[PDB]
Coordinates of all heavy atoms in Angstrom, one line a residue:
Chain B
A5 N 18.9 51.9 10.6 CA 17.8 51.9 9.7 C 18.0 53.1 8.7 O 18.4 54.2 9.2 CB 16.5 52.1 10.4
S7 N 16.2 55.2 5.4 CA 15.0 55.4 4.6 C 15.3 55.7 3.2 O 16.3 56.5 2.9 CB 14.2 56.5 5.2 OG 13.3 57.0 4.3
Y8 N 14.6 55.1 2.2 CA 14.7 55.5 0.8 C 13.3 55.8 0.3 O 12.3 56.0 1.1 CB 15.4 54.4 0.1 CG 14.6 53.1 0.0 CD1 13.9 52.8 -1.1 CD2 14.7 52.2 1.0 CE1 13.2 51.6 -1.2 CE2 14.0 51.0 0.9 CZ 13.3 50.7 -0.2 OH 12.6 49.5 -0.3
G10 N 10.8 54.2 -1.6 CA 9.8 53.3 -1.3 C 9.5 53.0 0.1 O 8.4 53.1 0.6
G11 N 10.5 52.5 0.9 CA 10.4 52.2 2.3 C 11.6 52.4 3.1 O 12.3 53.4 3.0
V12 N 11.9 51.4 3.9 CA 13.1 51.4 4.8 C 13.9 50.2 4.7 O 13.4 49.1 4.3 CB 12.7 51.7 6.3 CG1 12.1 53.1 6.4 CG2 11.7 50.7 6.7
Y42 N 8.7 47.0 12.0 CA 9.7 46.2 12.7 C 10.4 47.2 13.7 O 10.3 48.4 13.6 CB 10.7 45.6 11.8 CG 10.3 44.3 11.1 CD1 9.2 44.2 10.4 CD2 11.1 43.2 11.3 CE1 8.8 43.1 9.8 CE2 10.7 42.0 10.7 CZ 9.6 41.9 10.0 OH 9.2 40.8 9.4
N75 N -0.4 53.0 11.3 CA 0.8 53.8 11.0 C 2.0 53.4 11.8 O 1.9 52.6 12.7 CB 0.4 55.3 11.2 CG -0.6 55.8 10.3 OD1 -0.7 55.5 9.2 ND2 -1.5 56.7 10.9
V76 N 3.1 54.1 11.5 CA 4.3 53.9 12.3 C 4.3 54.8 13.5 O 4.9 54.5 14.6 CB 5.6 54.1 11.5 CG1 6.8 53.6 12.3 CG2 5.5 53.3 10.2
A77 N 3.6 56.0 13.4 CA 3.5 56.9 14.5 C 2.8 56.2 15.7 O 3.3 56.4 16.8 CB 2.7 58.1 14.1
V100 N 12.3 52.1 15.6 CA 11.1 51.6 15.1 C 11.0 52.1 13.6 O 10.9 53.3 13.4 CB 9.9 52.1 15.9 CG1 8.6 51.5 15.3 CG2 10.0 51.6 17.3
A101 N 11.0 51.1 12.7 CA 11.0 51.5 11.3 C 9.9 50.7 10.6 O 9.7 49.5 10.9 CB 12.3 51.3 10.6
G102 N 9.2 51.3 9.6 CA 8.2 50.6 8.9 C 7.7 51.4 7.7 O 8.2 52.5 7.4
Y103 N 6.6 50.9 7.1 CA 6.0 51.5 6.0 C 4.5 51.5 6.1 O 3.9 50.4 6.5 CB 6.4 50.8 4.7 CG 5.7 51.2 3.5 CD1 6.0 52.3 2.7 CD2 4.6 50.5 3.0 CE1 5.3 52.7 1.6 CE2 3.9 50.8 1.9 CZ 4.3 52.0 1.2 OH 3.6 52.4 0.1
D104 N 3.8 52.6 5.9 CA 2.4 52.7 5.9 C 2.0 53.4 4.6 O 2.7 54.3 4.1 CB 1.9 53.5 7.1 CG 2.6 54.7 7.4 OD1 3.7 55.0 6.7 OD2 2.2 55.5 8.3
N107 N 2.0 57.7 4.9 CA 3.3 58.5 4.9 C 4.5 57.8 4.4 O 5.6 58.2 4.6 CB 3.6 59.0 6.4 CG 2.5 59.9 6.9 OD1 2.3 61.0 6.4 ND2 1.8 59.4 7.9
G108 N 4.3 56.7 3.6 CA 5.4 56.1 3.0 C 6.3 55.3 4.1 O 5.7 54.6 4.9
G109 N 7.6 55.5 4.0 CA 8.5 54.8 4.9 C 8.9 55.8 6.0 O 9.2 57.0 5.7
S110 N 9.0 55.3 7.2 CA 9.3 56.1 8.4 C 10.2 55.4 9.3 O 10.1 54.2 9.5 CB 8.0 56.5 9.1 OG 7.0 56.9 8.1
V111 N 11.1 56.2 10.0 CA 12.0 55.7 10.9 C 12.0 56.6 12.2 O 12.2 57.8 12.0 CB 13.4 55.6 10.4 CG1 14.5 55.5 11.5 CG2 13.6 54.5 9.4
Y112 N 11.8 56.0 13.3 CA 11.8 56.7 14.6 C 12.9 56.1 15.5 O 13.1 54.9 15.5 CB 10.4 56.6 15.3 CG 9.3 57.2 14.6 CD1 8.7 56.6 13.6 CD2 8.8 58.4 15.1 CE1 7.6 57.2 12.9 CE2 7.7 59.0 14.5 CZ 7.1 58.4 13.4 OH 6.1 59.0 12.8
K122 N 11.8 61.5 15.0 CA 11.5 60.9 13.6 C 12.5 61.4 12.7 O 12.6 62.6 12.4 CB 10.1 61.3 13.2 CG 9.9 61.2 11.7 CD 8.5 60.8 11.3 CE 8.3 61.0 9.8 NZ 9.2 60.2 9.0
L123 N 13.3 60.5 12.1 CA 14.5 60.9 11.4 C 14.4 60.3 10.0 O 13.5 59.6 9.6 CB 15.8 60.3 12.1 CG 15.9 60.7 13.5 CD1 16.8 59.7 14.2 CD2 16.6 62.1 13.6
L179 N 11.5 46.8 4.1 CA 10.1 47.0 4.2 C 9.6 48.1 3.3 O 10.0 49.2 3.4 CB 9.7 47.4 5.7 CG 10.1 46.4 6.8 CD1 10.5 47.2 8.0 CD2 9.0 45.5 7.0

Side-chain angles (χ1 to χ4, degrees):
Chain B
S7 157
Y8 65 99
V12 293
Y42 277 58
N75 295 322
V76 191
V100 179
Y103 171 83
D104 45 353
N107 298 293
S110 314
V111 164
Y112 294 77
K122 161 148 167 56
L123 306 156
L179 301 147

